[PDB]
């Protein structure tokens, strides 16, 4: 398992514009297009990201291309975030994957806000981090996914994804 397979599991793959769990226009593997209510606007953002008039539908390849870009961007956001980087650097490879998934899902800013779990993680206090992480809107709104990511961070193994 790796970060790509992991997020491909959590986000799925859809070739036509769809709305995510919050109601936002998204396409591919969890690629948000806009927070706006407008399909037209979503469509504009999509053709802009793809480089052609998609009419709201893309190919697998194009979807994987956006995904590659988004993963990369998630890593680079972590590395540039002064509150995120040190946690990330302290972690083993599997746990790092968990942090990349959260950031992909909620953005840098959002995750940087989990001050307390960040610190427990940094301290390698796994069970404690796990309990804190679950006290969040994130967990109450997308509990199945949150649970898989939280077990990943807690245990350092991919068991939740097998
Ligand atoms: Cl883009
Ligand atoms: Cl769920
Ligand atoms: Kr994490
Ligand atoms: Kr976190
Ligand atoms: Kr954790």
UniProtKB/Swiss-Prot annotation:
Substrates-to-products reaction catalysed: Hydrolysis of (1->4)-beta-linkages between N-acetylmuramic acid and N-acetyl-D-glucosamine residues in a peptidoglycan and between N-acetyl-D-glucosamine residues in chitodextrins
pH dependence: Optimum pH is 7.3.
Binding site for substrate: 32, 104, 117, 132
InterPro entries noted in UniProt: Endolysin_T4_type, Glyco_hydro_24, Lysozyme-like_dom_sf, Lysozyme_dom_sf, Phage_lysozyme-like, T4-type_lysozyme
Main location: host cell
GO molecular function terms attached to this record: lysozyme activity
Gene Ontology BP terms: cell wall macromolecule catabolic process; defense response to bacterium; peptidoglycan catabolic process; viral release from host cell by cytolysis
Induction behaviour: Expressed late in the viral replication.
Keyword hit for Hydrolase: yes
CDD domains recorded: T4-like_lys
Gene Ontology cellular-component annotations: host cell cytoplasm
EC number(s) per entry: 3.2.1.17
Effect of residue 26 to H: Facilitates transglycosylation more effectively than hydrolysis; covalently bound substrate
Effect of residue 11 to A/F/H/M/N: Complete loss of enzymatic activity
Record keywords, A-Z: Antimicrobial, Bacteriolytic enzyme, Cytolysis, Glycosidase, Host cell lysis by virus, Host cytoplasm, Hydrolase, Viral release from host cell
Active site: 11 (proton donor/acceptor), 20 (proton donor/acceptor)
Effect of residue 26 to E: Complete loss of activity at neutral pH; covalently bound substrate
EC main group: hydrolase
The family this protein is said to belong to: Belongs to the glycosyl hydrolase 24 family.
HAMAP family: ENDOLYSIN_T4
Job of this protein: Endolysin with lysozyme activity that degrades host peptidoglycans and participates with the holin and spanin proteins in the sequential events which lead to the programmed host cell lysis releasing the mature viral particles. Once the holin has permeabilized the host cell membrane, the endolysin can reach the periplasm and break down the peptidoglycan layer.
Protein name, entry field: Endolysin
Organism: Enterobacteria phage T4
Gene name as annotated: E
């Amino acid at each position: 398992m790796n970060i790509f397979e992991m997020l491909r599991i959590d986000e799925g793959l859809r070739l036509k514009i769809y709305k995510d769990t919050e109601g936002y226009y998204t396409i591919g593997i969890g690629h948000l297009l806009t927070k706006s209510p407008s399909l037209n606007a979503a469509k504009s953002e999509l053709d802009k990201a793809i480089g052609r008039n998609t009419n709201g539908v893309i190919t697998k390849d194009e979807a994987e291309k956006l995904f590659n870009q988004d993963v990369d961007a998630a890593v680079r956001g972590i590395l540039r975030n002064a509150k995120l980087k040190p946690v990330y650097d302290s972690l083993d490879a599997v746990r790092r994957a968990a942090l990349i998934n959260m950031v992909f899902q909620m953005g840098e800013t959002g995750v940087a806000g989990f001050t307390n779990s960040l610190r427990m993680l940094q301290q390698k206090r796994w069970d404690e981090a796990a309990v804190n992480l679950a006290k969040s809107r994130w967990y109450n709104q997308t509990p199945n996914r949150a649970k898989r990511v939280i077990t990943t961070a807690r245990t350092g193994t991919w068991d939740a994804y097998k």
